[PDB]
Symmetry: C5
Subunit: 83 residues, 5 copies
Protein backbone atom coordinates (compact mmCIF):
# COMPACT_ATOMS: atom_id res chain seq x y z
CA UNK A 1 0.00 0.00 0.00
CA UNK A 2 2.42 2.82 1.07
CA UNK A 3 5.76 3.39 -0.66
CA UNK A 4 8.63 5.83 -0.04
CA UNK A 5 11.20 6.75 -2.73
CA UNK A 6 14.05 9.27 -2.59
CA UNK A 7 17.03 10.83 -4.28
CA UNK A 8 19.84 13.08 -2.95
CA UNK A 9 21.70 16.27 -4.12
CA UNK A 10 20.10 16.50 -7.65
CA UNK A 11 16.63 15.48 -8.88
CA UNK A 12 17.79 14.88 -12.54
CA UNK A 13 20.12 11.98 -11.72
CA UNK A 14 19.95 8.79 -9.73
CA UNK A 15 20.43 6.68 -7.69
CA UNK A 16 16.87 6.63 -6.43
CA UNK A 17 16.25 4.63 -3.24
CA UNK A 18 13.05 2.61 -3.76
CA UNK A 19 12.82 0.35 -0.69
CA UNK A 20 13.93 -0.96 2.70
CA UNK A 21 14.81 -4.65 3.46
CA UNK A 22 11.10 -5.51 3.99
CA UNK A 23 9.91 -4.07 0.64
CA UNK A 24 7.78 -6.09 -1.83
CA UNK A 25 10.34 -8.26 -3.69
CA UNK A 26 8.10 -8.45 -6.80
CA UNK A 27 7.83 -4.66 -7.11
CA UNK A 28 11.60 -4.23 -6.43
CA UNK A 29 12.34 -6.76 -9.22
CA UNK A 30 9.87 -5.05 -11.60
CA UNK A 31 11.72 -1.70 -11.06
CA UNK A 32 15.11 -3.36 -11.70
CA UNK A 33 16.28 -2.54 -8.16
CA UNK A 34 19.46 -3.86 -6.50
CA UNK A 35 20.30 -4.28 -2.79
CA UNK A 36 23.29 -2.06 -1.80
CA UNK A 37 24.78 -0.85 1.46
CA UNK A 38 25.75 2.82 1.68
CA UNK A 39 29.13 3.40 3.38
CA UNK A 40 28.43 4.18 7.06
CA UNK A 41 25.18 2.18 7.18
CA UNK A 42 24.82 -1.42 8.48
CA UNK A 43 21.68 -2.38 6.48
CA UNK A 44 20.95 -2.95 2.78
CA UNK A 45 18.51 -0.80 0.84
CA UNK A 46 16.90 -1.13 -2.63
CA UNK A 47 17.97 1.35 -5.29
CA UNK A 48 17.80 1.95 -9.03
CA UNK A 49 20.16 3.96 -11.27
CA UNK A 50 17.23 5.84 -12.86
CA UNK A 51 16.35 9.40 -11.85
CA UNK A 52 13.12 9.70 -9.78
CA UNK A 53 10.92 10.99 -12.69
CA UNK A 54 11.38 7.59 -14.43
CA UNK A 55 10.62 5.66 -11.22
CA UNK A 56 7.41 7.72 -10.70
CA UNK A 57 6.27 6.84 -14.27
CA UNK A 58 6.91 3.10 -13.65
CA UNK A 59 5.10 3.21 -10.26
CA UNK A 60 2.02 4.82 -11.84
CA UNK A 61 1.75 1.80 -14.21
CA UNK A 62 1.60 -0.40 -11.04
CA UNK A 63 -1.32 1.70 -9.62
CA UNK A 64 0.69 3.95 -7.27
CA UNK A 65 0.01 7.66 -6.95
CA UNK A 66 1.99 10.49 -5.35
CA UNK A 67 0.37 11.73 -2.12
CA UNK A 68 3.26 14.01 -1.11
CA UNK A 69 6.77 15.18 -2.04
CA UNK A 70 9.11 16.85 0.46
CA UNK A 71 12.69 17.93 0.98
CA UNK A 72 14.60 16.99 4.13
CA UNK A 73 18.32 17.93 4.36
CA UNK A 74 19.71 17.11 0.87
CA UNK A 75 17.08 14.38 0.23
CA UNK A 76 14.00 14.73 -1.93
CA UNK A 77 11.32 12.17 -0.80
CA UNK A 78 8.05 11.01 -2.43
CA UNK A 79 5.25 9.28 -0.47
CA UNK A 80 3.13 7.09 -2.76
CA UNK A 81 -0.01 4.99 -2.14
CA UNK A 82 -1.77 2.11 -3.98
CA UNK A 83 -5.64 2.15 -3.85
Amino acid sequence: PYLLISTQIRMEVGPTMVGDEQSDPELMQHLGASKRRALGNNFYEYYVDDPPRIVLDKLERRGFRVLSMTGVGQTLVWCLHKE
Copy 2:
Protein backbone atom coordinates in the same frame (compact mmCIF):
# COMPACT_ATOMS: atom_id res chain seq x y z
CA PRO B 1 -8.53 12.35 15.01
CA TYR B 2 -5.17 13.95 14.06
CA LEU B 3 -1.96 11.97 14.33
CA LEU B 4 1.68 12.98 13.85
CA ILE B 5 4.40 10.41 13.18
CA SER B 6 8.09 10.99 12.42
CA THR B 7 11.51 9.51 11.79
CA GLN B 8 15.01 11.05 11.75
CA ILE B 9 18.21 10.83 9.60
CA ARG B 10 16.96 7.97 7.29
CA MET B 11 13.44 7.09 6.09
CA GLU B 12 14.10 3.31 5.64
CA VAL B 13 14.98 2.58 9.29
CA GLY B 14 13.27 3.33 12.58
CA PRO B 15 12.69 4.34 15.31
CA THR B 16 9.45 6.01 14.27
CA MET B 17 7.88 8.36 16.84
CA VAL B 18 4.14 7.66 16.94
CA GLY B 19 2.81 9.70 19.88
CA ASP B 20 3.00 12.17 22.77
CA GLU B 21 1.79 11.71 26.46
CA GLN B 22 -1.84 12.38 25.43
CA SER B 23 -1.92 9.76 22.64
CA ASP B 24 -4.62 7.06 22.49
CA PRO B 25 -3.21 4.22 24.66
CA GLU B 26 -5.11 1.55 22.70
CA LEU B 27 -3.72 2.74 19.31
CA MET B 28 -0.19 2.95 20.86
CA GLN B 29 -0.62 -0.67 22.10
CA HIS B 30 -1.94 -1.79 18.67
CA LEU B 31 1.24 -0.40 17.01
CA GLY B 32 3.51 -2.11 19.59
CA ALA B 33 4.79 1.27 20.83
CA SER B 34 7.12 1.70 23.77
CA LYS B 35 6.82 4.77 26.05
CA ARG B 36 9.96 6.72 27.05
CA ARG B 37 11.30 10.09 28.22
CA ALA B 38 14.31 10.93 26.03
CA LEU B 39 17.52 12.36 27.56
CA GLY B 40 17.08 16.04 28.49
CA ASN B 41 13.33 16.09 27.68
CA ASN B 42 10.54 17.03 30.12
CA PHE B 43 7.92 14.92 28.31
CA TYR B 44 7.13 11.36 27.29
CA GLU B 45 6.91 10.00 23.77
CA TYR B 46 5.82 6.79 22.09
CA TYR B 47 7.98 5.06 19.52
CA VAL B 48 8.22 1.84 17.54
CA ASP B 49 11.32 0.16 16.03
CA ASP B 50 9.58 -0.17 12.62
CA PRO B 51 10.43 2.11 9.71
CA PRO B 52 7.67 4.65 8.86
CA ARG B 53 6.42 2.78 5.69
CA ILE B 54 5.29 -0.10 7.99
CA VAL B 55 3.64 2.29 10.47
CA LEU B 56 1.74 4.05 7.59
CA ASP B 57 0.40 0.66 6.44
CA LYS B 58 -0.76 -0.21 9.96
CA LEU B 59 -2.44 3.17 10.43
CA GLU B 60 -4.39 2.78 7.16
CA ARG B 61 -5.92 -0.46 8.55
CA ARG B 62 -7.12 1.67 11.54
CA GLY B 63 -8.79 4.27 9.27
CA PHE B 64 -5.99 6.86 9.11
CA ARG B 65 -5.14 8.67 5.88
CA VAL B 66 -2.00 10.76 5.10
CA LEU B 67 -2.89 14.45 4.71
CA SER B 68 0.69 15.74 4.48
CA MET B 69 4.38 14.76 4.69
CA THR B 70 7.19 17.25 5.30
CA GLY B 71 10.85 17.60 6.22
CA VAL B 72 12.04 19.86 9.07
CA GLY B 73 15.70 19.75 10.13
CA GLN B 74 16.64 16.02 10.02
CA THR B 75 13.06 14.90 10.74
CA LEU B 76 10.56 13.53 8.23
CA VAL B 77 6.99 14.09 9.58
CA TRP B 78 3.59 12.73 8.49
CA CYS B 79 0.27 14.33 9.43
CA LEU B 80 -2.57 11.77 9.43
CA HIS B 81 -6.35 12.08 9.95
CA LYS B 82 -8.90 9.39 10.95
CA GLU B 83 -12.21 9.18 9.03
Copy 3:
Protein backbone atom coordinates in the same frame (compact mmCIF):
# COMPACT_ATOMS: atom_id res chain seq x y z
CA PRO C 1 -11.04 31.69 6.31
CA TYR C 2 -7.25 31.00 6.38
CA LEU C 3 -5.31 30.16 9.53
CA LEU C 4 -1.62 29.54 10.20
CA ILE C 5 -0.41 27.63 13.28
CA SER C 6 3.13 26.52 14.22
CA THR C 7 5.45 24.90 16.73
CA GLN C 8 9.27 24.80 17.05
CA ILE C 9 11.96 22.14 17.81
CA ARG C 10 9.58 19.23 18.74
CA MET C 11 6.09 18.43 17.39
CA GLU C 12 4.94 16.65 20.63
CA VAL C 13 5.18 19.69 22.93
CA GLY C 14 4.01 23.29 22.79
CA PRO C 15 3.91 26.27 22.73
CA THR C 16 1.88 26.40 19.53
CA MET C 17 1.57 29.82 17.86
CA VAL C 18 -2.05 30.26 16.74
CA GLY C 19 -2.40 33.89 15.59
CA ASP C 20 -1.11 37.32 14.61
CA GLU C 21 -2.38 40.75 15.89
CA GLN C 22 -5.25 40.74 13.34
CA SER C 23 -6.58 37.27 14.34
CA ASP C 24 -10.24 36.66 15.29
CA PRO C 25 -10.38 37.53 19.03
CA GLU C 26 -13.27 35.11 19.65
CA LEU C 27 -11.37 32.13 18.09
CA MET C 28 -8.22 33.08 20.09
CA GLN C 29 -10.35 33.14 23.28
CA HIS C 30 -12.00 29.76 22.37
CA LEU C 31 -8.49 28.18 22.05
CA GLY C 32 -7.38 29.69 25.40
CA ALA C 33 -4.63 31.71 23.68
CA SER C 34 -2.53 34.45 25.31
CA LYS C 35 -0.78 37.43 23.69
CA ARG C 36 3.02 37.64 23.77
CA ARG C 37 5.66 39.88 22.21
CA ALA C 38 8.83 37.84 21.61
CA LEU C 39 12.22 39.34 22.49
CA GLY C 40 13.30 41.99 19.97
CA ASN C 41 9.98 41.88 18.04
CA ASN C 42 7.74 44.93 17.42
CA PHE C 43 4.57 42.75 17.17
CA TYR C 44 2.55 40.42 19.41
CA GLU C 45 1.36 36.93 18.60
CA TYR C 46 -1.18 34.50 20.08
CA TYR C 47 -0.01 31.21 21.54
CA VAL C 48 -1.28 28.25 23.57
CA ASP C 49 0.71 25.81 25.77
CA ASP C 50 -0.89 22.78 24.03
CA PRO C 51 0.99 20.69 21.49
CA PRO C 52 -0.16 21.23 17.86
CA ARG C 53 -2.07 17.88 17.60
CA ILE C 54 -4.50 19.18 20.29
CA VAL C 55 -4.88 22.56 18.53
CA LEU C 56 -5.63 20.79 15.20
CA ASP C 57 -8.38 18.74 16.94
CA LYS C 58 -9.93 21.95 18.42
CA LEU C 59 -9.75 23.76 15.05
CA GLU C 60 -11.50 20.86 13.25
CA ARG C 61 -14.50 21.32 15.63
CA ARG C 62 -14.61 25.00 14.45
CA GLY C 63 -14.77 23.91 10.75
CA PHE C 64 -11.06 24.22 9.88
CA ARG C 65 -9.28 21.63 7.74
CA VAL C 66 -5.53 21.15 7.16
CA LEU C 67 -4.58 22.14 3.61
CA SER C 68 -0.81 21.86 4.11
CA MET C 69 1.96 21.16 6.63
CA THR C 70 5.57 22.24 6.06
CA GLY C 71 8.89 22.59 7.82
CA VAL C 72 10.94 25.80 7.60
CA GLY C 73 14.09 26.18 9.74
CA GLN C 74 13.15 24.66 13.14
CA THR C 75 9.43 25.52 12.70
CA LEU C 76 6.65 23.13 11.70
CA VAL C 77 3.74 25.12 10.16
CA TRP C 78 0.15 24.13 9.31
CA CYS C 79 -2.04 26.05 6.87
CA LEU C 80 -5.75 25.59 7.64
CA HIS C 81 -8.88 26.66 5.78
CA LYS C 82 -12.52 27.07 6.80
CA GLU C 83 -14.59 25.70 3.82
Copy 4:
Protein backbone atom coordinates in the same frame (compact mmCIF):
# COMPACT_ATOMS: atom_id res chain seq x y z
CA PRO D 1 -3.62 30.71 -13.46
CA TYR D 2 -0.63 30.02 -11.12
CA LEU D 3 0.48 32.40 -8.37
CA LEU D 4 3.40 32.28 -5.94
CA ILE D 5 3.47 34.28 -2.69
CA SER D 6 6.03 34.24 0.14
CA THR D 7 7.24 35.64 3.45
CA GLN D 8 10.53 35.34 5.36
CA ILE D 9 11.69 34.71 8.99
CA ARG D 10 8.18 34.88 10.58
CA MET D 11 4.76 33.94 9.21
CA GLU D 12 2.80 36.47 11.36
CA VAL D 13 4.35 39.60 9.85
CA GLY D 14 4.96 40.92 6.39
CA PRO D 15 6.25 41.91 3.90
CA THR D 16 4.63 39.28 1.70
CA MET D 17 6.07 38.99 -1.84
CA VAL D 18 3.12 38.65 -4.24
CA GLY D 19 4.62 38.90 -7.74
CA ASP D 20 7.41 39.09 -10.29
CA GLU D 21 8.05 41.47 -13.31
CA GLN D 22 5.39 39.68 -15.40
CA SER D 23 2.58 39.59 -12.79
CA ASP D 24 -1.00 40.75 -13.57
CA PRO D 25 -0.89 44.54 -12.93
CA GLU D 26 -4.59 44.67 -12.03
CA LEU D 27 -4.26 41.88 -9.38
CA MET D 28 -1.17 43.65 -7.96
CA GLN D 29 -3.17 46.91 -7.75
CA HIS D 30 -6.13 45.08 -6.11
CA LEU D 31 -3.77 43.71 -3.39
CA GLY D 32 -2.25 47.19 -2.80
CA ALA D 33 1.19 45.93 -3.88
CA SER D 34 4.24 48.11 -4.54
CA LYS D 35 7.27 47.50 -6.78
CA ARG D 36 10.71 47.30 -5.16
CA ARG D 37 14.02 46.09 -6.56
CA ALA D 38 15.79 44.65 -3.50
CA LEU D 39 19.50 44.77 -2.49
CA GLY D 40 21.54 42.21 -4.41
CA ASN D 41 18.79 41.82 -7.03
CA ASN D 42 18.46 42.58 -10.74
CA PHE D 43 14.70 41.86 -11.01
CA TYR D 44 11.74 43.76 -9.58
CA GLU D 45 9.22 42.23 -7.19
CA TYR D 46 5.78 43.12 -5.98
CA TYR D 47 5.14 43.13 -2.25
CA VAL D 48 2.54 44.10 0.36
CA ASP D 49 3.06 44.98 4.06
CA ASP D 50 0.30 42.52 5.12
CA PRO D 51 1.13 39.15 6.66
CA PRO D 52 0.49 36.14 4.35
CA ARG D 53 -2.78 35.02 6.12
CA ILE D 54 -4.41 38.31 4.98
CA VAL D 55 -3.08 37.91 1.41
CA LEU D 56 -4.44 34.31 1.25
CA ASP D 57 -7.90 35.61 2.32
CA LYS D 58 -7.83 38.33 -0.39
CA LEU D 59 -6.67 35.82 -3.07
CA GLU D 60 -9.53 33.43 -2.23
CA ARG D 61 -12.02 36.25 -3.04
CA ARG D 62 -10.33 36.44 -6.52
CA GLY D 63 -10.82 32.66 -7.13
CA PHE D 64 -7.39 31.42 -6.04
CA ARG D 65 -6.97 28.27 -3.99
CA VAL D 66 -3.84 27.06 -2.11
CA LEU D 67 -2.37 23.99 -3.82
CA SER D 68 0.78 23.80 -1.70
CA MET D 69 2.82 25.49 1.04
CA THR D 70 6.54 24.83 1.60
CA GLY D 71 9.60 26.06 3.44
CA VAL D 72 12.92 26.73 1.66
CA GLY D 73 15.79 28.37 3.59
CA GLN D 74 14.09 31.10 5.69
CA THR D 75 11.25 31.53 3.17
CA LEU D 76 7.71 30.19 3.50
CA VAL D 77 6.11 29.89 0.00
CA TRP D 78 2.50 29.29 -1.13
CA CYS D 79 1.57 28.02 -4.59
CA LEU D 80 -1.95 29.11 -5.61
CA HIS D 81 -4.16 28.15 -8.59
CA LYS D 82 -7.18 29.93 -10.01
CA GLU D 83 -10.40 27.92 -10.39
Copy 5:
Protein backbone atom coordinates in the same frame (compact mmCIF):
# COMPACT_ATOMS: atom_id res chain seq x y z
CA PRO E 1 3.64 10.95 -17.06
CA TYR E 2 5.30 12.77 -14.21
CA LEU E 3 7.40 15.92 -14.49
CA LEU E 4 9.83 17.65 -12.12
CA ILE E 5 10.73 21.35 -12.45
CA SER E 6 12.84 23.56 -10.14
CA THR E 7 14.43 26.94 -9.48
CA GLN E 8 17.14 28.10 -7.02
CA ILE E 9 17.66 31.05 -4.59
CA ARG E 10 14.60 33.14 -5.67
CA MET E 11 11.18 32.00 -6.97
CA GLU E 12 10.57 35.16 -9.10
CA VAL E 13 13.54 34.72 -11.46
CA GLY E 14 14.81 31.89 -13.63
CA PRO E 15 16.50 29.74 -14.76
CA THR E 16 13.95 27.02 -14.28
CA MET E 17 15.27 23.47 -14.70
CA VAL E 18 12.63 21.53 -16.69
CA GLY E 19 14.25 18.16 -17.48
CA ASP E 20 16.89 15.45 -17.28
CA GLU E 21 18.70 13.81 -20.30
CA GLN E 22 15.78 11.36 -20.86
CA SER E 23 13.05 14.07 -20.92
CA ASP E 24 10.47 14.27 -23.72
CA PRO E 25 12.34 16.07 -26.57
CA GLU E 26 9.09 17.50 -27.99
CA LEU E 27 8.01 19.03 -24.61
CA MET E 28 11.53 20.49 -24.11
CA GLN E 29 11.32 22.03 -27.61
CA HIS E 30 7.79 23.39 -26.89
CA LEU E 31 9.08 25.12 -23.70
CA GLY E 32 12.09 26.57 -25.59
CA ALA E 33 14.50 24.66 -23.32
CA SER E 34 18.27 24.38 -23.86
CA LYS E 35 20.70 21.67 -22.73
CA ARG E 36 23.35 22.72 -20.21
CA ARG E 37 25.97 20.69 -18.34
CA ALA E 38 26.68 22.47 -15.06
CA LEU E 39 30.24 22.88 -13.61
CA GLY E 40 31.57 19.51 -12.39
CA ASN E 41 28.46 17.53 -13.36
CA ASN E 42 28.53 14.20 -15.19
CA PHE E 43 25.12 14.86 -16.85
CA TYR E 44 23.13 17.35 -18.93
CA GLU E 45 19.92 19.08 -17.94
CA TYR E 46 17.24 21.11 -19.67
CA TYR E 47 16.47 24.66 -18.59
CA VAL E 48 14.55 27.79 -19.63
CA ASP E 49 15.20 31.43 -18.68
CA ASP E 50 11.57 31.95 -17.56
CA PRO E 51 10.64 32.07 -13.87
CA PRO E 52 8.75 28.98 -12.63
CA ARG E 53 5.27 30.70 -12.55
CA ILE E 54 5.45 31.07 -16.36
CA VAL E 55 6.61 27.46 -16.84
CA LEU E 56 3.68 26.24 -14.64
CA ASP E 57 1.23 28.21 -16.86
CA LYS E 58 2.75 26.66 -20.06
CA LEU E 59 2.65 23.15 -18.53
CA GLU E 60 -1.05 23.56 -17.62
CA ARG E 61 -1.80 24.18 -21.35
CA ARG E 62 -0.11 20.77 -22.03
CA GLY E 63 -2.36 19.02 -19.44
CA PHE E 64 0.00 19.05 -16.45
CA ARG E 65 -1.26 19.78 -12.94
CA VAL E 66 0.84 20.55 -9.84
CA LEU E 67 0.64 17.65 -7.35
CA SER E 68 3.23 19.03 -4.92
CA MET E 69 5.76 21.82 -4.29
CA THR E 70 8.69 21.54 -1.84
CA GLY E 71 11.88 23.22 -0.71
CA VAL E 72 15.16 21.30 -0.44
CA GLY E 73 18.40 23.20 0.26
CA GLN E 74 18.19 26.36 -1.88
CA THR E 75 15.94 24.63 -4.49
CA LEU E 76 12.20 25.01 -4.97
CA VAL E 77 10.79 21.90 -6.72
CA TRP E 78 7.37 21.21 -8.31
CA CYS E 79 6.06 17.71 -9.07
CA LEU E 80 3.55 17.73 -11.94
CA HIS E 81 1.28 15.04 -13.41
CA LYS E 82 -0.53 14.77 -16.75
CA GLU E 83 -4.09 13.39 -16.92
